[PDB]
């Protein structure tokens, strides 16, 4: 079965072209005579431009194939203009005209100058790899993918070893190693069918690594989670039920080790954890299961009275990095409680606890979020004392942050 037809250009487009040129009152047989001649020349060239596609070993007809198909038929590749003399440009392709259907048809002549030029890509290089080792295709990233008998593990004896080298490198004794392992996790194509043992090693590790608050052990495991996530080959949402309570624990937990000093890293432990937490709510999303569940736990962490301030700071960060609308709808009715907590830490003399440090970090983070939440939905008028209607927390400094954001927008 083949119902192949002969499609030509419409004749009602050929009369528009003729009467817009000075040739009026053309007959239909005169006009049909134009649209079978030019529809043959389009068919003659597209059949001839398919020769250059096959010879160049491509499956996509590029724009340059018609430039060589035209030159082959002794017609100039120039499309925009036609030179009768033909001497200024002799069968020289000018690359066509970058024109659109939905274009503006008028631009400003300094808009084209002030835009940044695109980056010239890398030059052609020759790398070698292995498709087959004595018949077997390796799983390198340059490749695409009555007694019962004594069973074998679903990993090669060798297979167990990498699990072993990558895990002993990912506990971060040396930083370049850490990276070598990291490189492997982020782009090994054959890292599926080893992923249960990696997820179990992560999950089990954080839970026996918060018994004593060992920050590096945790910062390395969170980097291992981040390296597991951006791998495109492996299927992760079968294992995310172990991954998510591990990261929530990094963000919402108390620190058993020295309270100050590494709190700077602790903020990053909560910074890396809140980054991977909102990346996990970005992916793996179905109706009302993952994002709303972690949002509900973050909000009942917030509205809980008389919290640990480490847990408070971590949950504040976690609810803060959830996107545009989430701080637009959630952080709004709670400024008074935040201010009262700050006032209590300030009044009570107790300085040797971690409450004061937790309070300062929470206030700074909340004030930065409130700044764009404001820069985003209102004009920058009355930036001096109108914020005193919101208890006067960030005030003019918040206004200065909004002004810096406006300057960044102007630079963009």
């Amino acid at each position: 079965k083949l119902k192949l037809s002969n499609t030509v250009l419409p004749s009602e487009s050929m009369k528009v072209v003729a009467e817009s040129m000075g040739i009026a009152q053309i007959q239909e047989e005169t006009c049909q005579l134009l649209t079978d001649e030019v529809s043959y020349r389009i068919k003659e060239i597209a059949q001839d431009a398919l020769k250059f596609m096959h010879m160049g070993k491509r499956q996509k007809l590029t724009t340059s194939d018609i430039d060589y198909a035209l030159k082959l038929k002794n017609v100039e590749p120039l499309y925009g203009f036609h030179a009768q003399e033909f001497i200024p440009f002799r069968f020289a392709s000018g690359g066509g005209r970058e024109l659109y259907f939905y274009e503006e048809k008028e631009v400003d002549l300094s808009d084209i100058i002030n835009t940044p030029l695109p980056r010239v890509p890398l030059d052609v290089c020759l790398k070698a790899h292995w498709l087959s080792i004595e018949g077997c295709q390796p799983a390198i990233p340059e490749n695409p993918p009555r007694l019962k008998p004594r069973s074998i593990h679903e990993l090669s004896v060798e297979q167990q070893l990498y699990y072993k080298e990558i895990t002993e490198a990912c506990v971060g004794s040396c930083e370049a190693k850490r990276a070598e392992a990291l490189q492997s996790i982020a782009t090994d194509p054959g890292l599926y069918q080893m992923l249960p043992r990696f997820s179990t090693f992560i999950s089990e590790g954080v839970r026996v690594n918060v018994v004593q608050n060992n920050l590096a052990l945790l910062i390395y495991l969170m980097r291992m989670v981040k390296a597991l996530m951006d791998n495109p080959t492996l299927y992760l949402e079968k294992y995310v039920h172990e991954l998510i309570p591990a990261v929530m624990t990094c963000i919402v937990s108390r620190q058993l080790c020295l309270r100050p000093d590494v709190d700077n890293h602790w903020a990053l432990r909560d910074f890396a954890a809140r980054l991977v937490a909102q990346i996990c709510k970005h992916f793996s999303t179905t109706t009302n299961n993952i994002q709303s569940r972690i949002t509900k736990t973050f909000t009942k962490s917030w509205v809980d009275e008389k919290t640990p301030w480490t847990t408070r700071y971590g949950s504040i960060a976690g609810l803060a990095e959830l996107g545009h609308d989430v701080i637009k709808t959630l952080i709004l009715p709670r400024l008074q409680q935040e201010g009262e907590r700050i006032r209590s830490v300030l009044d009570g003399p107790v300085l040797s606890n971690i409450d004061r440090i937790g309070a300062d970090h929470v206030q700074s983070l909340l004030l930065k979020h409130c700044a764009p939440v404001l820069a985003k939905l209102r004009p920058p008028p009355d930036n001096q004392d109108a914020y005193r209607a919101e208890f006067g927390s960030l005030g003019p400094l918040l206004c200065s942050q909004v002004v810096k954001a406006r300057a960044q927008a102007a630079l963009q």
């Binding site: 918060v210 018994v211 949402e237 995310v240 998510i244 929530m248 624990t249 793996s284 179905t286 993952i290």
Partner: peptide
């Protein structure tokens, strides 16, 4: 549609919130 593979993934069938360790000791 309740036999869709996702329904049976244990993220959508497990109270994994209970695992998060808060103030452990």
């Amino acid at each position: 549609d309740l036999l869709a593979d996702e329904n049976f993934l244990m993220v959508t069938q497990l109270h994994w919130e209970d695992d998060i360790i808060w103030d452990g000791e």
